[PDB]
Amino acid sequence: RPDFCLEPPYTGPGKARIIRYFYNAKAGLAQTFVYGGKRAKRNNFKSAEDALRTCGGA
Known part of the structure; x- marks a missing residue:
């Protein structure tokens, strides 16, 4: 699994x-988050x- 997939989401400045969307490490779900642009x-x-195609696989 790519090494960024289990990180928390990053809104930015x-x-x-x-x-x-981010891949949620704990749940194994694609979840929405607010991104600053x-x-x-x-x-x-x-x-x-x-998110699932890139991060969903072990």
Whole structure:
């Protein structure tokens, strides 16, 4: 599993409220979070299905 997948979500310093997805380590679910619009980390996806494709596999 890519080494960024089990990290907490990162809003960043931006002032936007873009609803992105992260893979939630504990639950094994794609979950929404508020993204500021800049300086993204890698556990940050445009869709639930993208989070699962990239992070969902052991």
